[PDB]
Write a new protein. Sequence first.
Length: 169
Amino acid sequence: NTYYRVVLIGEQGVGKSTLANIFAGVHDSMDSDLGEDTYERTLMVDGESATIILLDMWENKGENEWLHDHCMQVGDAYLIVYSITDRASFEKASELRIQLRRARQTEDIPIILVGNKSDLVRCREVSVSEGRACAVVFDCKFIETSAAVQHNVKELFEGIVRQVRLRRD
Ligand SMILES: Nc1nc2c(ncn2[C@@H]2O[C@H](COP(=O)(O)OP(=O)(O)O)[C@@H](O)[C@H]2O)c(=O)[nH]1
């Protein structure tokens, strides 16, 4: 089907739920078109409609299943989120990315490293240029977002759709 399934991973506190909720928006209850930690919404990209399923399950079992079961949730793209104001979370993200590489199934799947909370300039602990450096060295795409100020949130999800489309030929 024409669904774009995006899996959100990263340390607790980095803003995965906020970013999902901010991209999802508040939905019109009359829309007939999905339970635990799941966001679904259509979005027009480059002229063609895309149905994005966002899976935010890492805190409820996703992380433990990675550790104990050695299994990652199936997606068309993975979003590895850290907070620009938290260096430990950034190192987790890099660790997660390296570990994901070893799921050889994910070879031709878009992985995006996301530095969230770019609105917190004064608390910044990770530079833009080292987020980028990590992306280049560990073979990701890279973006900085703010879910609070809603910066690069649409651009993130349009970019995921274009990458996923580039794959399917
Ligand atoms: N200032 C700021 N705070 C954020 C942003 N995104 C999330 N947060 C806050 O970070 C805290 C944890 O965010 P949450 O969405 O629960 O992170 P999660 O554990 O990764 O799902 C909350 O207090 C959020 O309000 C952001 O872009 N800017």
